[PDB]
């Protein structure tokens, strides 16, 4: 510990703190919805409060904080994050006791505090990445800041592990722990009225941020115009090219990793990271190691990041050839009788087998029979008696008497040919995660060398605004819009099933085009750097 290593330890602890807090916000939002009895637009607005608070002031704090005492301001931001977590846990402490109280064929204002501390957490997230990493760069020795950045991004993945374990553990217990005798609660954690101890999650997050706040305040400053500088950032063509590039690439990353589980469910039929976390943590540290040990300059780091994204997209193009066959669903892609396909999935005709008993056509109760054809309800499958479902008459046979019953409930799994293709899919996603982590620190590491040395904090703040705004918010919105234009059964809400060929084509091809655009901008950007340098 030569003075600087103490700062890297404290900054790694703060990275764990903020990445823990993000997972706690993502995990304990359903319990807040059940406890506060708030609507979907309201809980989305509370969820977006963090982005509002961060995106309002991130450029101003990153600009005005570089000339000031940087570790003290990082500690102040960590303390504001802890106060926001404590304030988010605060409305539980003074509300009181929480209160909570087969489709057969027929032949109030306390949420503001949870809002407000979340905004504080937004300011808590604000000075960590721009002011911290820049304070790394002017006083770490040359080549070493990539290694410290890879170490910090590897160490910060401990935070989601702590968040997942504490979230599951404190969601297993009741919200009124320590206040009521536990034998008096009649409901189970699987019930729809259960609320876990979300206040415990925000309490441990706030106290962890508060504990991480102290080691910043004892670090020294050194170990041994706004529009004018912001115009100087924006008028650099290499920087605005790199920011548009990284917007496209990170938007592809976010629009992929938001819907990986939905793609797995609607393609391979397997329902929705123990091994992937060592792969990611080794990949990011390996990226820092390759940048540090090989003595890469700025065009070298640009070429290395380009190479990693080329291998990532080379494995990403292979996902088109591992598609399973489409689901055999009666009433959406074919008619209910199983003889004639239908031209379009909107307002399909009814069949003569299921004309007789009138059930809900919009009801979704997935079953499949002996023949492997998925049926959408036991009313529309012809099944009149259930124990399994029996006497199903919407399955045409040429006198096969035994093929009239034995239909289980749920979406039964697909063939074993594409079950191996699912394992191929998971292996290629592991390789893509490894190469994305191998890219990793290069996005930050190019920015501090593109700009002037006294505008690195402003540049990192503006880039972080752009990535969290047009990549963190709008990119899942238009990915969800383009994905939901391929819905095949609308539940009156989110669609239950998708058209697997069309959904696969759109979800893969949008990220493919969005990646090849940044891959073209690689040749443009390295061409510009090689002309300049």
């Amino acid at each position: 510990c030569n003075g600087l290593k103490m700062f890297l330890a404290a900054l790694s602890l703060s990275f764990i703190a903020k990445t823990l807090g993000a997972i706690i916000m993502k995990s304990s939002i359903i319990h807040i919805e059940r406890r506060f009895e708030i609507s979907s637009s309201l809980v989305g607005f509370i969820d977006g409060s963090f982005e509002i608070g961060n995106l309002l002031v991130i450029v101003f704090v990153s600009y005005f904080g570089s000339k000031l005492h940087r570790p003290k301001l990082i500690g102040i931001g960590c303390f504001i994050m802890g106060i926001g977590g404590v304030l988010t846990a605060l409305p539980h402490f003074f509300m009181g006791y929480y209160r909570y109280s087969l489709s057969t064929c027929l032949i109030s204002y306390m949420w503001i505090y949870v809002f407000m501390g979340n905004m504080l957490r937004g300011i808590g997230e604000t000075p960590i990445v721009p002011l911290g990493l820049s304070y790394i760069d002017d006083f770490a020795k040359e080549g070493h800041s990539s290694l410290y950045l890879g170490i910090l991004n590897a160490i910060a993945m401990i935070g989601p592990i702590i968040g997942f374990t504490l979230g599951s553990l404190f969601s297993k217990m009741y919200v009124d722990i320590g206040y009521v005798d536990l034998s008096t609660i009649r409901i189970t954690p699987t019930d729809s009225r259960w609320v876990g101890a979300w206040w415990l999650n925000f309490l441990v997050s706030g106290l962890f941020s508060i504990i991480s706040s102290i080691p910043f305040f004892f670090l020294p400053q050194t170990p041994n115009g706004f529009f004018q500088s912001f115009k100087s950032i924006l008028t650099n063509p290499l920087y605005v090219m790199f920011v548009l590039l990284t917007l496209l690439q990170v938007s592809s990353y976010i629009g992929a990793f938001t819907y990986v589980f939905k793609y797995v469910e609607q393609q391979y039929g397997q329902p929705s990271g123990v091994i992937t976390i060592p792969i990611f943590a080794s990949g990011m540290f390996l990226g820092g190691y390759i940048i540090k040990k090989f003595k890469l300059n700025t065009v070298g780091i640009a070429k290395f990041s380009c190479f990693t994204a080329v291998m990532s997209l080379s494995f990403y193009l292979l996902y088109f050839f591992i598609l399973c066959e489409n689901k055999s669903v009666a009433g959406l892609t074919m008619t209910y009788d199983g003889n004639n396909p239908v031209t379009s999935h909107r307002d399909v005709p009814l069949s003569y087998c299921n004309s007789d008993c009138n059930c809900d056509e919009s009801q979704w109760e997935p079953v499949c029979g002996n023949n492997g054809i998925t049926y959408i309800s036991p009313c529309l499958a012809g099944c009149k008696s259930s124990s399994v479902f029996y006497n199903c008459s919407c399955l045409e046979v040429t006198g096969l008497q035994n093929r009239n019953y034995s239909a289980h409930l749920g979406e039964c799994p697909r063939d074993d040919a594409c079950t191996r293709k699912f394992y191929f899919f998971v292996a290629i996603q592991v390789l893509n995660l490894f190469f994305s982590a191998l890219g990793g620190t290069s996005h930050v590491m190019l920015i501090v060398k593109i700009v002037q040395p006294e505008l690195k904090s402003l540049a990192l703040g503006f880039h972080s605004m752009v990535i969290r705004a047009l990549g963190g918010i709008l990119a899942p919105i238009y990915f969800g819009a383009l994905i939901d234009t391929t819905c095949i059964k609308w539940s009156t809400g989110s669609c239950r099933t998708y058209n697997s060929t069309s959904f696969s084509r759109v979800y893969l091809g949008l990220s493919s085009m969005l990646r090849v655009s940044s891959l073209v901008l690689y040749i443009i950007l390295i061409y510009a750097m090689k002309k300049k340098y």
């Binding site: 003074f94 009181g96 209160r99 109030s108 306390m110």
Partner: protein, 120 residues
Amino acid sequence: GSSSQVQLVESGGGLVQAGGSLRLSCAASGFPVNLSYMHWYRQAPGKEREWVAAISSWGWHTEYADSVKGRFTISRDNAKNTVYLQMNSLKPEDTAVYYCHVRVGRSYFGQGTQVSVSAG
């Protein structure tokens, strides 16, 4: 507000005749109770703690039980720091002792007064 704990005392309880009207009061002393909800519970003999009513910090939220609805009205005064409960059009099934609940830090309850209702 240097105090040990919050003490809650009920007032205005008394015997009624038929479907009359009661004027219940809950006075709190000690910590500042500007930010805390106050609830009213009942305790009928032979039955557990049933919940009756609640009031928010500033009185913007009034949440009630389904058993007594349209007749009980809860109200607050922040300056006197005292929660009132208007009761009217009663039945003798409402005969219980009424406890006042606040959770400034720890859950606090009152002594309670008999809100005994005669038959008429």
